[PDB]
Structures are given as C-alpha cells and as structure tokens.
C-alpha cells in the first residue's frame, strides 16, 4: 500500500508512474557503467 515513507522527499505510487523512472533508469544504468 502507498503508506510507509512518512517524510518529505518523494510521495508517489508505483505502477505506470515508476515505469517512467525504472525504464529511464535502464538507459541511465548502461550509461553509468561506462564511468561507474
């Protein structure tokens, strides 16, 4: 459930939304490895 992170930082639920971050994270992953 969308309840646990009771603090100011990031308040968003996964499913379709985190699909943007997780997908964009993929490219950013093989791009970071080059200089990680």
UniProtKB/Swiss-Prot annotation:
Pfam family, one: Hormone_3
Keyword Transmembrane carried by entry: no
Name of the protein described by the UniProt record: Peptide YY
Protein family (similarity comment): Belongs to the NPY family.
Residues with Tyrosine amide modification: 36
Subcellular location field: Secreted
Record GO terms (molecular function): hormone activity; neuropeptide Y receptor binding
Keyword field: Amidation, Hormone, Phosphoprotein, Secreted
Record-listed Phosphoserine modification sites: 13
Site feature location: Cleavage: 2-3
Main localisation: secreted
PROSITE patterns: PANCREATIC_HORMONE_1 (PS00265), PANCREATIC_HORMONE_2 (PS50276)
Function according to Swiss-Prot or TrEMBL: This gut peptide inhibits exocrine pancreatic secretion, has a vasoconstrictory action and inhibitis jejunal and colonic mobility.
Post-translational modification: The peptide YY form is cleaved at Pro-2 by the prolyl endopeptidase FAP (seprase) activity (in vitro) to generate peptide YY(3-36).
Organism field: Sus scrofa
């Amino acid at each position: 459930y969308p309840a646990k992170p009771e603090a100011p930082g990031e308040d968003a639920s996964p499913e379709e939304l985190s699909r943007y971050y997780a997908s964009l994270r993929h490219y950013l992953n093989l791009v970071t490895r080059q200089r990680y």
